[PDB]
């Protein structure tokens, strides 16, 4: 649908959509930009991530509201409407996750050769499989969970070899993989260990950073600390 718009115009419009809090539009513009077939710059990758995280974040929040209402109903024997509407929102959410995973597979990941881009996209792949796992209940749920795990693990392996422990994408990846362990894989000890080791190794590397890099890294470290406080 965006095939007739210039790549640069799609990027410009994605930035305007962000300013206007029109995240569905922002995601459609960035999907159009990805489909031009060129690699994405650092800023462009962030626009893609922000757009879809906001879209799927609203869907996940709505799914959780409806799932809670449905659970309370299954404990007055009301009709099919709550389940039907939860299923409608769930199918929409799955469609957005499949769209993002499709962009990563065709062909963002295979062309990403630098560590920063490859880790970024593998983290995204883990995240969107994690969102699929949050709603999964059927024959393929274990395979969805393993797909998230595998993507996060490859990203971790690259990040530990190629990036300093304070690198914001490395930190955000570890944060999200720890959430995966706690919330999805039923491995709270692994989640806590990962968050603590990540925090401590970043702390020891802050001395190398400029004031601006220090601000970026410590912001994510605080999220790790917030989870450790919640979990311990």
């Amino acid at each position: 649908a965006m095939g007739s718009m210039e790549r640069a115009s799609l990027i410009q419009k994605a930035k305007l959509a962000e300013q206007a809090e029109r995240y569905e539009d922002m995601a459609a513009f960035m999907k159009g930009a990805v489909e031009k077939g060129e690699e994405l710059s650092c800023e462009e990758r962030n626009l893609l991530s922000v757009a879809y995280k906001n879209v799927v974040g609203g869907q996940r929040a709505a799914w959780r509201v409806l799932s809670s209402i449905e659970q309370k109903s299954n404990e007055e024997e009301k009709g099919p409407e709550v389940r039907e509407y939860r299923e409608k929102v769930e199918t929409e959410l799955q469609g957005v996750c499949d769209t993002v995973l499709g962009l990563l597979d065709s062909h963002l990941i295979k062309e990403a050769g630098d560590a920063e881009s490859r880790v970024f996209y593998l983290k995204m792949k883990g995240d969107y499989y994690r969102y699929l796992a949050e709603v999964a209940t059927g024959d393929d749920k274990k395979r969805i969970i393993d797909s998230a795990r595998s993507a996060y693990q490859e990203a971790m392996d690259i990040s530990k070899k190629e990036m300093p422990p304070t690198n914001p994408i490395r930190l955000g990846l570890a944060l999200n993989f720890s959430v995966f362990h706690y919330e999805i894989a039923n491995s709270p000890e692994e989640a806590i260990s990962l968050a603590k080791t990540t925090f401590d190794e970043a702390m020891a590397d802050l001395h190398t950073l400029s004031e601006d890099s220090y601000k970026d890294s410590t912001l994510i470290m605080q999220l790790l600390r917030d989870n450790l406080t919640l979990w311990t």
């Binding site: 922000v50 995280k53 995240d127 955000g172 944060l175 999200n176 959430v179 706690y182 919330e183 994510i220 999220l223 917030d226 989870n227 919640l230 979990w231």
Partner: peptide
């Protein structure tokens, strides 16, 4: 509550 994943 739910834990914090990455967010800006």
């Amino acid at each position: 509550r739910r834990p914090s994943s990455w967010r800006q």
